[PDB]
Amino acid sequence: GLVPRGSHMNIAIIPARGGSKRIPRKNIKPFHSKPMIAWSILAAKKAGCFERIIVSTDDAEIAAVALEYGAEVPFTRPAEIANDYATTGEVISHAINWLINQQGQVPENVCCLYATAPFVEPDDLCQGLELLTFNKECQFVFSATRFSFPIQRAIKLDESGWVSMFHPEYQLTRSQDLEEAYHDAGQFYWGKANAWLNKLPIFAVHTQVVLLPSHRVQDIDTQDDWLRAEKLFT
């Protein structure tokens, strides 16, 4: 863990908490015959732009699996309570301060990579760094994806199933004429260390995205989702 004199310290933090309600043991449940978190550690390792890849967990079993797959677990966070679910920003800040305070290493660019993100592309990770660093004023870069249907044409259902538009002014508007819309794909978030530390708001500062195609963005929120995403990963 020597580094070039003059190089910038770029790291991956992979948060993972125990306790997930919908899919028990979600972060270590097998996905295509590895614990789910393995795929994120593996992608971070293959990307080649990180000098450290750390799992931040509050759970000793998850810690064990992360070490098994070659991530660093330099600390274990104390178990969270349900009425105090730590935000991503709180976990990332914790890790950055811990590195500074406990190890005297000052991160510059910090990538939060989700534990459940098995279609993440090593290359998208590196593209995000490059966008973060090329644009001097950029504080964050996150994985995003296009909405597959125009948000302007969204409808709501009343309590009796009756349809109405959210925005009736677009009822007759040409599709070509609707402004393109995107959302957070929920896979990775690069930020400048000071951005995370200062709790800058990602969607309101100088933020860029790496755009992922729809097929690489997969919901894995239920057991039925986990099955369908396994069948597709093969």
Add this chain to the structure above:
Amino acid sequence: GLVPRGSHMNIAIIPARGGSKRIPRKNIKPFHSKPMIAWSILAAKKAGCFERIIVSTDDAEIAAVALEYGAEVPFTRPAEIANDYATTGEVISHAINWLINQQGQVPENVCCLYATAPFVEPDDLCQGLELLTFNKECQFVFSATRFSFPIQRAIKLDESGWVSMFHPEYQLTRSQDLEEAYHDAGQFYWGKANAWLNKLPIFAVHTQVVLLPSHRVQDIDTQDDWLRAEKLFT
């Protein structure tokens, strides 16, 4: 083609035009080793709630394939021009008037089923009828699906890649507190015959939906999409 005395005339119309720019011959291109339109005719036949299943096309080759798979092609529309792409409503109205005028049969409930809709469930088709008919004032029922990410948190990109929110007032709003949003899945549209004939606006009248789960709603807009949707259909 005898019917019970006192029964209501319920039909499927499957529009199909030639000329598709992105996927040539899209409506008859093989999908899992049948022409794409076959899957829609097949589902309509299996649903068991239609007394006629008609393909409305402007193309003799498509007509041939539709007859081959057991749809009726009682007429061929004259080829369209590119500067006069007929709306769904125009095609449906044409077919309904044609049945009345040319054959003296008056449709009551009319289902427009897209030619490219291979994950459509026979049962969803029948559920739509039942919703159309149970609710006296209902003019339309269409296949819809939830947005997978909240539309209120959508972002836009300026010409330099810079992120901003469409609706900054929701920057800190709880996910639980966002109103659920849906969109037209683009698979089928039931309507009362008079609704189609009177050109009633689907999203502004008495309209219901049949809600399809995300995995059954698949984009098939490109050649790469056609491949991925074949791999999944197996």
